[PDB]
């Protein structure tokens, strides 16, 4: 309960931003205007983050 990926995304292999099921992940803006930045483990996220959890 926070901001699940809503699927998994899985960028490419267990290296880059790759979610699974719903392990959730942090992020910085890009919820309404943008949607290609997050923070799963302190890094320049590149996941969709669209229609996640409308987190303020």
Tab-separated table of C-alpha atoms in Angstrom:
chain	number	residue	atom	x	y	z
A	1	UNK	CA	0.000	0.000	0.000
A	2	UNK	CA	1.888	3.029	-1.317
A	3	UNK	CA	2.808	3.056	-5.015
A	4	UNK	CA	2.925	-0.418	-6.567
A	5	UNK	CA	4.137	-0.857	-10.153
A	6	UNK	CA	0.697	-2.226	-11.092
A	7	UNK	CA	2.388	-5.083	-12.970
A	8	UNK	CA	6.190	-5.387	-12.892
A	9	UNK	CA	7.555	-3.257	-15.748
A	10	UNK	CA	10.790	-5.281	-15.826
A	11	UNK	CA	13.162	-3.048	-17.795
A	12	UNK	CA	15.640	-5.753	-18.804
A	13	UNK	CA	17.106	-8.553	-16.687
A	14	UNK	CA	17.771	-8.194	-12.917
A	15	UNK	CA	19.935	-5.108	-13.430
A	16	UNK	CA	17.938	-1.969	-14.217
A	17	UNK	CA	14.544	-0.841	-12.922
A	18	UNK	CA	12.592	-4.110	-12.966
A	19	UNK	CA	9.529	-4.549	-10.752
A	20	UNK	CA	7.621	-7.773	-10.083
A	21	UNK	CA	4.093	-8.485	-8.844
A	22	UNK	CA	3.947	-5.514	-6.486
A	23	UNK	CA	7.025	-4.880	-4.353
A	24	UNK	CA	6.278	-1.144	-4.513
A	25	UNK	CA	8.966	1.507	-4.967
A	26	UNK	CA	9.802	5.123	-4.110
A	27	UNK	CA	9.861	8.008	-6.589
A	28	UNK	CA	10.114	11.762	-7.121
A	29	UNK	CA	7.191	13.470	-8.860
A	30	UNK	CA	6.133	12.417	-12.372
A	31	UNK	CA	2.699	11.224	-11.235
A	32	UNK	CA	0.450	13.669	-13.088
A	33	UNK	CA	2.650	15.584	-15.530
A	34	UNK	CA	5.426	13.046	-16.093
A	35	UNK	CA	5.755	9.307	-15.476
A	36	UNK	CA	9.268	7.991	-16.132
A	37	UNK	CA	11.157	8.545	-12.875
A	38	UNK	CA	11.269	6.681	-9.563
A	39	UNK	CA	13.542	5.465	-6.763
A	40	UNK	CA	13.559	1.718	-6.100
A	41	UNK	CA	17.016	1.800	-4.513
A	42	UNK	CA	18.441	5.312	-4.844
A	43	UNK	CA	18.872	5.818	-8.590
A	44	UNK	CA	17.472	7.527	-11.685
A	45	UNK	CA	14.331	5.426	-12.063
A	46	UNK	CA	12.862	4.936	-15.529
A	47	UNK	CA	9.629	3.075	-14.782
A	48	UNK	CA	6.116	4.119	-15.939
A	49	UNK	CA	4.688	4.893	-12.499
A	50	UNK	CA	1.375	5.711	-14.185
A	51	UNK	CA	-1.979	5.164	-12.453
A	52	UNK	CA	0.007	3.807	-9.504
A	53	UNK	CA	-1.597	5.156	-6.324
A	54	UNK	CA	-2.045	8.879	-7.040
A	55	UNK	CA	0.561	9.433	-4.323
A	56	UNK	CA	0.816	13.132	-3.477
